[PDB]
Every structure is written in C-alpha cells, then in structure tokens.
Design a binder for this molecule. Structure first.
Ligand SMILES: *[C@@H]1O[C@H](CO)[C@@H](O)[C@H](O)[C@H]1NC(C)=O
Lengths: 49, 49
C-alpha cells in the first residue's frame, strides 16, 4: 500500500517489473451519506380513541 | 471483421456489488476472479494486436 509501484509489485508477485501498463486495483467512490425516503405518514391509527 | 469491443468486467463488483459479507464469502473461491480478469485483459490486448 506504499505507492503504485509497490501495488504493481505485489499484484505481479514480483520484485522486478518489466516495462508496461498493469491493472492493479479498482477505483470506487464510496457512498458518503445514507438516504431514506418514504411516503408521508398518514392515517395515524386512532390509539387516541 | 478485425476487432471486437474491449470489454473488461470486475468480479467483486459484479458478483458482490458493494457488499462486505458477499465479498468476504467470495474470498473463499481463490483466484477465480483474478484469472477471469486475466482472460478478459488478454482478449483486449489481442484486439489491439
Ligand atoms: C391523549 O391526549 C393527550 C393530550 O391531547 C396526549 O398527550 C396523549 O398522547 C393522548 N393519548 C394517546 C394514546 O395518544
């Protein structure tokens, strides 16, 4: 996890990296906050009764 | 015809899209997904060739 070159070395399981372009990991935006949306609360049951 | 479309697919996001428990369960299967990605990347390099 030190640097991209180290990620490349770990993925190839090698200490020597021959010239080229290597796909090492996957970028992914993590979700920041959670959203919950439901219909308007209506017909509150008459526990008042 | 000369070339295909260079399509690559990520297992972890395909099989277990943004799921911790599913990703942990998928770890037990070994390098199935590393070799899937390897096959697809080989195909794409072949398309450029
Ligand atoms: C009964 O009425 C009072 C005052 O209006 C209210 O505070 C209370 O919550 C009511 N009881 C129920 C079960 O809603």
């Amino acid at each position: 996890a030190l640097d991209p070159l180290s990620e490349t070395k770990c993925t190839l399981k090698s200490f020597t990296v021959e010239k080229g372009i290597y796909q090492t990991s996957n970028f992914r935006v993590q979700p920041t906050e959670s959203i919950v949306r439901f219909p308007n609360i209506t017909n509150l049951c008459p526990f008042g009764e | 015809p000369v070339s295909m479309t260079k399509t690559s697919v990520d297992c972890t996001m395909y099989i277990c899209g943004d799921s911790t428990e599913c990703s942990n369960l998928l770890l037990q299967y070994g390098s199935f997904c590393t070799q899937l990605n390897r096959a697809l990347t080989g195909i794409a390099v072949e398309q450029d060739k």
